[PDB]
């Protein structure tokens, strides 16, 4: 009955002086916008229908047309920034916030969804949704003693929308908004549904992506041990944001980094550093590089958890961008480590894979590796064992590599390589 209408017929029905005709036409629009790819969003906008749909959101005495218009507007708002803007420009934000109070759960749910699409567009619309007062009624929908009593899809949609209110960092969400949302996020992080867990973790990954002051707000909520638990989940959609959040936290102070270590994060890294998902390996190695930029006692925890052989492994064989993260881990380790820690690193076999990467066509990893080599030689000087190290480097073809770099285009590279050769070879 409402299947496969033309836009022209939809317009005719919506302009009729008959609320039932308007309802049927709005349902026809919903079906057009939901039964295909790609739905004719631009034709619907061009037809001038958004203001009508927004007016229907307020028809409390006709809940079916509230639902149909909410769904239609959700899908329009799911599109490009221009398409989402058309929805906002029609006055949809306060109309959707009012609809959060609907006694019909399927209607409140659709308003949640629509607000998530609007906030998802970017920081400006995110902050506009917050200014119109969305957070209080959204959080009130979750104010039940046991989240498990809520319909699963309903709870998933609420979690997703809250995560979009936490998303984007130019600028970051208002401090007061984050403070209001965080206690609910903490609760969702303990809810046993894989999508709720994934999207809660995403929210935390956004909130920790910024200055150390933003990291501190999250760490103070006590969530790091739960993040570490989720880091060991079997589902990749949970591990991915949990690892991003953990990685973000260790970009922070030595004290913030210590919370991650204290929570037992390092025990998960043998699996993360060998994960068959390339991006997991990359972010795990990035995370390790920021931990080895820490204190000597934090470097020692990396050693104690047996992670140095895993860094040797990644340096030996991984995607190049992951190898570059491993090289960063090694220059940071050798810059901050004790002589004993550095000796241990060489005994684990770091030299050959390190030297093999000096043929890379990447100036930064060359600078990083030459710095690492210089730091290792400085340790060797203190033990008076530089000749021992020179032989090791010569034997795996490393001296040929460094000798070539004397004619490298970049000044820092050929100066650094000239220096090593002049001093140790």
């Amino acid at each position: 009955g409402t299947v496969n209408w033309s836009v022209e017929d939809i317009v005719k029905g919506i302009n009729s002086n008959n609320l039932e005709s308007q309802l049927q036409a709005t349902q026809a629009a919903r079906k057009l916008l939901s039964r295909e790819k790609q739905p004719p969003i631009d034709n619907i906008i061009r037809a001038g229908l958004i203001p009508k749909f927004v007016s229907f959101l307020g028809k409390t005495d006709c809940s079916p047309i509230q639902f149909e218009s909410a769904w239609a507007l959700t899908n329009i708002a799911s599109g490009t920034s221009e398409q989402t803007k058309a929805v906002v420009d029609g006055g949809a934000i306060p109309a959707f916030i009012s609809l959060l109070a609907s006694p019909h759960a399927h209607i409140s749910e659709q308003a949640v969804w629509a607000l998530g699409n609007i906030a998802g567009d970017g920081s400006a619309f995110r902050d506009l949704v917050i200014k119109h007062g969305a957070i209080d009624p959204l959080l009130a929908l979750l104010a039940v003693p046991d989240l498990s009593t809520l319909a699963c899809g309903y709870l998933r949609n609420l979690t997703w929308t809250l995560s979009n209110l936490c998303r984007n960092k130019n600028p970051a969400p208002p401090l007061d908004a984050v403070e209001q949302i965080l206690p609910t996020l903490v609760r969702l992080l303990h809810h046993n549904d894989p999508e709720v867990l994934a999207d809660s973790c995403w929210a935390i990954s956004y909130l920790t992506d910024g200055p150390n002051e933003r990291i501190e707000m999250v760490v103070k909520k006590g969530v790091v041990p739960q993040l570490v638990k989720l880091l060991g989940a079997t589902e990749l959609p949970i591990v991915t944001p949990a690892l991003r959040a953990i990685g973000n936290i260790v970009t922070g102070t030595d004290e913030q980094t210590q919370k991650v270590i204290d929570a037992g994060a390092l025990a998960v890294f043998p699996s993360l550093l060998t994960n068959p998902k390339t991006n997991i390996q990359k972010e795990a190695t990035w995370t390790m590089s920021n931990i080895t930029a820490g204190r000597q006692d934090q470097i020692q925890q990396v050693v104690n958890h047996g992670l140095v052989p895993f860094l040797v492994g990644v340096l030996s064989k991984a995607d190049f961008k992951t190898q570059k993260e491993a090289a960063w881990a090694i220059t940071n380790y050798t810059s901050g480590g004790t002589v004993e820690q550095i000796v241990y690193l060489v005994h684990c076999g770091i030299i050959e894979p390190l030297m093999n990467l000096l043929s890379a066509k990447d100036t930064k990893i060359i600078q990083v590796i030459l710095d690492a080599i210089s730091n290792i030689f400085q340790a060797a000087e203190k033990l008076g064992e530089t000749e021992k190290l020179s032989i090791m480097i010569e034997e795996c073809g490393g001296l040929d590599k460094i000798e070539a770099l004397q004619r490298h285009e970049n000044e820092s590279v050929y100066k650094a390589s000239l220096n090593l050769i002049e001093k140790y070879f």
Binding site: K31, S34, R35, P39, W71, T74, N75, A77, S78, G79, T84, Q110, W113, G116, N117, G120, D121, W160, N164, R167, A198, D199, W202, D209, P211, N212, T240, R244, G247, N248, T251, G252, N279, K282, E283, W286, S289, N290, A293, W328, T331, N332, S335, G336, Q367, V368, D371, N410, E411, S412, K415
Partner: protein, 72 residues
């Protein structure tokens, strides 16, 4: 000086794109992911970057910003 500079990777000679040279004390307050020129003991200016490095923000692994509700 040594203790401060341990937190940084020296990238090379002074690079004016990154502004006037900082003192070592000013450098110690540099934020993660940042670069700066620094005057080191004694007399030389070098370009450095902090060893704590910020997110790659891998768009490939990000989830969708928006969701369409399709017919079931």
């Amino acid at each position: 000086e040594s203790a401060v500079l341990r937190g940084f990777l020296i990238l090379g000679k002074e690079d004016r794109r990154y502004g006037p040279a900082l003192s070592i004390n000013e450098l110690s307050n540099l934020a993660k992911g940042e670069k700066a020129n620094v005057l080191i003991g004694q007399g030389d200016v070098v370009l450095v970057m902090k060893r704590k490095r910020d997110s790659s923000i891998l768009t490939d692994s990000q989830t969708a910003t928006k969701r369409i509700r399709m017919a079931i």
